[PDB]
Amino acid sequence: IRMVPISFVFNRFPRMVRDLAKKMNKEVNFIMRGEDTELDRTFVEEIGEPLLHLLRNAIDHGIEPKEERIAKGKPPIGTLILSARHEGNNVVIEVEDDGRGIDKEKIIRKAIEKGLIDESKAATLSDQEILNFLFVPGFSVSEVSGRGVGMDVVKNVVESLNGSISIESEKDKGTKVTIRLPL
């Protein structure tokens, strides 16, 4: 069991982010931090596709268009950060964007409609719990893209390796997703 820098995976994404950024007419700023931290050849190879998902949404859905984005006083060029820091005995990766932000009450209104939870205990769940509703399958008939990137696939890889994904978000201030990994 042999460890190689997290550079191996991270370095692939910039080309993609640029690619994906250009498809939806959005200019983005991509920052990668902590490339030197190291994980086992296994742990690195798995997370790429999971990480790739989290990046895409930020460009795709996280970062606003210039005209609407320029209005709020935030700089016109959105910023996307992928970082890995070696803290303690756990390896944590984070992806953050200065984006629209996930509207937490939209997730709460979806859990009630679909019966995941009833409304009167909505007060029970914590903000941290609300976004976990992004992890139920099919939270997202006539038409079906035979090809589908789901959020859970990520939750799984993380859960696969004894690891915990998390989502923190603040409407119109941005969202950040975090992946803690052991050893």
Ligand SMILES: CC1(C)C=C(CSSP(=O)(O)OP(=O)(O)OC[C@H]2O[C@@H](n3cnc4c(N)ncnc43)[C@H](O)[C@@H]2O)C(C)(C)N1O
């Ligand atoms: C109606 C909608 C959106 C659904 C589609 C199919 S949906 S399949 P999908 O894989 O896209 O669904 P996701 O499992 O990706 O969840 C995406 C859900 O989470 C939140 N969200 C996740 N990351 C976020 C981020 N960085 N910034 C802000 N919001 C984020 C989003 O507001 C969204 O509501 C298509 C593309 C046709 N379409 O126009």
